[PDB]
């Protein structure tokens, strides 16, 4: 989507494996602010937004 019409997706009721996202090198920039990326595999949230 365009910047002024950015796409928003809502995620719930699933198991997420962020490890496969982090170990992949396909991304130029991967920056986590409130959490440590290596700790994401343990915390359980609700109401994820992408």
């Amino acid at each position: 989507a365009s910047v002024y019409a950015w796409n928003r997706k809502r995620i719930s009721n699933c198991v997420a494996d962020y490890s496969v996202l982090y170990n992949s090198a396909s991304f130029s920039t991967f920056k986590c602010y409130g959490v440590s990326p290596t700790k994401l595999n343990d915390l359980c949230f609700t109401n994820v937004y992408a």
């Binding site: 409130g34 959490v35 440590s36 290596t38 700790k39 343990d42 915390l43």
Partner: protein, 49 residues
């Protein structure tokens, strides 16, 4: 029959209890950090922060 004739001892007890209560409740403050519980900070962040 008449009550409230022992205000001094009751006053002492109340003061002590109130001080202890506020000391305990101070443990829920934030002090400018992101959270007031050590476990959540420890289980969400890398040490350097």
């Amino acid at each position: 029959s008449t009550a409230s004739a022992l205000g001094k001892l009751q006053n002492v007890v109340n003061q002590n209890a109130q001080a202890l209560n506020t000391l305990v409740k101070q443990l829920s403050s934030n002090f400018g950090a992101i959270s007031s519980v050590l476990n959540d900070i420890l289980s969400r962040l890398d040490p350097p922060e």
